[PDB]
Every structure is written in C-alpha cells, then in structure tokens.
Amino acid sequence: GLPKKALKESQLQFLTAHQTYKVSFIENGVIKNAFYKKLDPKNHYPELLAKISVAVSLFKRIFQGRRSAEERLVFDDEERLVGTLSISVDGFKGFNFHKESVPQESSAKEQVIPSTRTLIEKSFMEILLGRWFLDDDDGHPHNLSLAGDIDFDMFFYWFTIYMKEVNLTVRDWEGFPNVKDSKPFHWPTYKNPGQETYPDPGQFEQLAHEPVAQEQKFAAALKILLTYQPEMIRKRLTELFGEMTLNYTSLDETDVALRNQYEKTFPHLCNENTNIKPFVDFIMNLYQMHYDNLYRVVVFYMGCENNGYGVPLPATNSALYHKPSFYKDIVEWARTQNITIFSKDDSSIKFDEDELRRRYHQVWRDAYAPTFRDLLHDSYSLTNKLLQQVSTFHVVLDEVEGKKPTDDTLTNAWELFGTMPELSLEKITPLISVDKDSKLRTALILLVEFTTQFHAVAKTYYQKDRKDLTEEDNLEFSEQLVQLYTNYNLKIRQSLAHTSTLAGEFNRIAVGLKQYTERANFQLHLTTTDEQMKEATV
C-alpha cells in the first residue's frame, strides 16, 4: 500500500482555514505541529525532487538529531503522492533579512541576527557543515536557525539543480565555513548572494578564524562519519518510503524534456533499468558518494600550518590521538539520542554501540594510513639506494604508487599504499654482487626483510573490512610493528653506521615507526583522557 511512516492529506487538521500551509496531526498518541508543502510539478518541486527532500531530512537527523526537521510523505486518499511534510523544529526562530526589523531587546535579535560568539555557544558549526556535506544551495536566512535547519528542497545541488531553474575538497574543509571551491548561491559568509542577503555576514566569516569553532567543525565531521550505520538507515528509510521505486519517469508529468535531460546527463543513475528499482537503493547509493567524499577529505587530512583565515589545523591522526573525548562524546550523544527521539522506535533501528565502536576503529585505522604509507614509501626508497650500491647491474626497482587521497574512485584506505612488485628476498638475492660489502650488503638484506614484513603487517590489518575488524586486529598490528622495530632497528642502523645520509635516512624511518606504533594502539587509546594526553606530550 503506502509507507509505514507516511501520512494522508485526509489525516491533517489545517490550522489556517511554495504552497506552504500550517498543519497539525496525530502521532503516537500526541499532536505534532508541522508545515505542509504541496507538489507543484509545473512549478519546480516535482515528485522525485520532493521525494529526495524527505530522504535528506532523515540522513541529516541521523547525525544531527532534533536539529534537523524530519519530513514525511503525504498521500491522497487513493495512494497518490501529493506533497511533503516538515515537523516543526522546537525552538525555531530563523534568521533575519537585512530588510526586516531589528528587535529592540538585544537578547532577541541575538537569535534572529546572531553575534559570532553566540554562534559558538549554540553550536551552529554543526548545522552549516551538514548543509555543505550534502551540497545545499539555499543557505539563505529563513532556512537556517540557531537551533536547527528545516528547508531541504535544494539539496544535492549537483543532481537536483535541473528542477529549479559532488566535489567537497580539502581546500573547503580547511577554511570552513568560507567555502569557495564548493560554490553555493546563498551562504552566511557571503556578503552578496552569488558571491562565488544576511545583515551581518561577517559574523559567520569569523568562524573560520576562531580555533574553538574549528574543533566544533571536526566534532561535526566525526559525527557524520561515525553515526553512519547503513544497516539501520536502510531500514529507517523504508519506514518513510516503503517499496517506492525511483520512478524518475514522473518527470514527464512536469515536462518530458526534463526526463530526457536526466537520462542523458546522468546515464549511470537514472535510466530505464534503475527507474523500476527501489528509491531507497538509489539515494543510498547517492549518499555513499558524499560519505566516501567526506571520508577522503577528513579522515586522511594531514594538517595545515595556517588556514587562509588564521587557524592551524592538526592532522586527524593527531586530533583523534590528542583528544580521545571526540569518540567518547559521540558515544554518549548516541545513547542519548537512543533514549530521546528513538525511544519509541524499535531496537533494530537504534544506534548499535558495538557497530559504532567498529566504525571508530575503522576511522582510527584509516586516519593513520597516510603516515604508514609514508613510512613504507620512505622505507621502499631507501631499499633502492641500497640495491644500487650493492647490485651488479645497479638495479633500481620501480614503485607502483597508490591512489591519491582525493581520487574520486578511492573507497578504502589500503588503496593509498604503493607497492614494489619485485621486492622479495627470493628476487633480490641473485641480484647482489659478492664484491661490494661495506656492511651495505648485509644492510640491504636486512632492510629487505624489514620492509617486506612491514608491508605485510600493514596489509593484513588494513585489508580487514569494517565487518571483520576486531580490536584484537589492532593489537596484532601493534604487537608486530613493535616486534619488527626491536628485531631490525639496531642491526640495520649498525650496518649503516659508517654511511652518512644513508644512515640518517633510516633514522627517520625507525623514529617514525616507533612513534606511530604506539600512537596507533587502539586499546590503549580508549583508556586515555584529554588531560592525560596533554601531559603525556610534555
């Protein structure tokens, strides 16, 4: 029939008597006020645009909670879509236009036109990041509030712009909220809409300068990454859509030329074959694009000395290690939301703490992939210089580089690691000359065994996927690197003692190996406190 969490226009008590009406209705034995929008296929907001706006409302509520209005699908009495709903956000006072009045109580206009310091007290960075995460184009004052956001009819700008009139880059993650590569039309930092109108836009521009605002931005990005439990989000979306198919053919009701625009511009997403498949599978496959994109930017971020606006940003491997409270807060916020807005929901669509832990374990592991690729690449490069000085034919081995951190085809972290296909003890022993042992001949054989074992241990631990990622796997990884360091660190740097730049090059590889063999210990990281980690570095 019609979805479980869908309503019917006949079930709505209008409080008045786009086409926005004020509405109330009954839910779980209590009334819930809301705002009603009616489908207008001939004035934008078609069926599949309205159908995407309700999925966005759910996606956002998973990591924002009550700060993102939940939307519903409303049908007529004959099971035909007619509009969408948007349950009122408790404590929504919206933002002012420069043409509207300026309240005379300073405590009431700090809610309508907020001061940059009051935005940090009310955690508005979490909201602005969510809009940027899903490429929102309508970040104009009335769609934003000091306690949440409500309007989603202009989300997924890269795929939805055609019914009105993804590339999240590291450069935007650095100087956020001053987005510039990702170009919205309305944004709080903008002074003039279309810059790449708020009465005081500079109040939002300063959030990129304040360091406390950047910590809230990181805590927001980590919430988006860790709350993502797809196994439930698929179940919860079917509560709002059921077996509804994608059905992009409904664009014919608006104009057949638009359907032709979509099947020609996006052939891999909305075609004859996908048009009959569930709308859930379509937008989930569409959401994972944004997730993998935000995952590449944040989890692999390696730091910055100065944003374009004043604050230095740490590498996420250091931010997670130095501040273990980030994860401890997401776990507390999850249990809170489990007994808050999910109290009446079933156990099978609640935050699973165990799954949330493995997710953080992944983000922990993958957040270190760069500094372990770097050590393996530095360890590779030094094995070549030794193979040049010891081999008869001055053999230099080629290194297949791994995919860059911003390549849009990158999903898991193990693809960041380069490989040396011919680096094997069985393949290098015959290449050595019995005429060039300055102790460099014994160093090559050692540094080959070292780099092989190193890469082998990284592989076994980085190929474990999230569903098979045991906290013991991180112990195995750490217990071997510490065994690797203790077995080769002395013998190798004793065999390079007589060299100059060649020895110092292995000093940095060993020093880094020791440091990040301990910083990466996950079981030990979960027992730390922000203050314990602030005094352990001095």
Ligand X SMILES: Nc1ncnc2c1ncn2[C@@H]1O[C@H](COP(=O)(O)OP(=O)(O)O)[C@@H](O)[C@H]1O
Contact residue for ligand X among 25, 35, 95, 248 (CB under 6 A): 35
- Choose, by CB under 6 A, the member of 13, 20, 265, 285 that binds ligand X: 20
Nearest to 440 by CA among 476, 479, 390, 485: 390
371 close to 436: Cβ distance less than 8 angstroms: no
Would you say 86 or 451 has its CB closer to Mg ion?
A: 86
Scanning 82-90, 259-267, 349-357, 403-411 for contacts with ligand X by CB under 6 A, the matching segment is 82-90
25 known member of a binding site: no
How many Cα atoms within 13 Å fall on the side-chain side of residue 228? Answer: 21
89 is in an annotated binding site: yes
Residues 355-414 that bind ligand X (CB under 6 A): none
* Minimum distance, C-beta of residue 45 to ligand X, in the bound complex (Å): 8
And the tokens for 426? 């069985």
The Cα–Cα gap between 102 and 503 comes to 68
Pick the closer one to ligand X by CB: 72 or 359.
72
| 85 is an interface residue for ligand X by CB under 6 A | no
Stretch that binds ligand X, among 143-151, 228-236, 238-246, 312-320 (CB under 6 A): 143-151
Told to check if 88 binds ligand X by CB under 6 A, we report yes
**Gap between the Cα atoms of 135 and 130, Å rounded:** 9
Give the 3-state secondary structure of residue 183: coil
Tell whether 35 is in a known binding site: yes
User: Does residue number 149 form part of the binding site for Mg ion (CB under 5 A)?
Assistant: no
Binding-site size for ligand X (CB under 6 A) equals 16
Other CB atoms within 10 A of residue 219 CB: 20
> In whole angstroms, what is the distance from residue 446 CA to residue 452 CA?
10
Residue 151 marked in a binding site: yes
> Which member of 5, 37, 72, 290 binds ligand X (CB under 6 A)?
37
- Among candidate residues 398, 402, 407, the one with its CA nearest the CA of residue 373: 402
Q: Segment near ligand X (CB under 6 A), from 59-67, 83-91, 244-252, 356-364?
A: 83-91
Given 47, 135, 137, 151, the residue binding ligand X (CB under 6 A): 151
CB-based burial, 56-74: b 16+ in 10 Å, e otherwise: bbbbbbbbbbbbbbbbbbb
Secondary structure (3-state) at 184:
coil
Residue 366 binding Mg ion, by CB under 5 A: no
**Is residue 153 near ligand X by the rule CB under 6 A?**
yes
Is position 143 annotated in a ligand binding site? yes
Q: Which of 397, 456, 455 has its CA nearest to residue 431?
A: 397
Single out the segment in contact with ligand X by CB under 6 A; choices: 142-150, 219-227, 375-383, 386-394. 142-150
Nearer to ligand X, 53 or 293 (CB): 53
How many residues can be counted in the chain? Answer: 538
Min separation Cβ 14 and ligand X, Å: 15
Shortest distance, position 164 Cβ to ligand X, whole Å? 10
57 known member of a binding site: no
Q: Is 178 annotated as a binding residue?
A: no
Of the two residues 165 and 354, which places its CB atom closer to Mg ion in the complex?
Answer: 165
**Cis, peptide link before residue 177, omega less than 30° from 0:** yes
Out of 47, 71, 151, 215, the residue judged to bind Mg ion by CB under 5 A:
151
Can you tell me which of 12, 54, 56, 69 binds ligand X, judged by CB under 6 A? 69
Closest to ligand X by CB, 100 vs 352, is 100
135 neighbors 182 (Cβ within 8 angstroms): yes
- Interatomic CA distance for residues 511 and 48, integer angstroms: 55
Strand 73-75 to 7-8 pairing = parallel
Told to check if 153 binds Mg ion by CB under 5 A, we report yes
What type of residue sits at position 224?
I
- Report, in Å, the least distance between residue 364 CB and Mg ion: 38
What end-to-end distance do the CA atoms of the chain give, in Å? 64
- Calculate the alpha carbon distances from 250 to 40, 150, 247, 416, 488 in Å: 12, 25, 6, 42, 66
Instruction: Say whether residue 92 binds ligand X (CB under 6 A).
Output: yes
- Say if strands 7-8 and 13-14 run parallel, antiparallel, or are unpaired: unpaired
CB of 153 to ligand X, least distance (A): 5
| Three-state SS at 101 | coil
The residues in 122-141 that bind Mg ion, with binding defined as CB under 5 A, are 138
Residues that bind Mg ion (CB under 5 A): 138, 151, 153
Residues that bind ligand X (CB under 6 A): 18, 20, 35, 37, 69, 86-89, 92, 94, 142-143, 150-151, 153
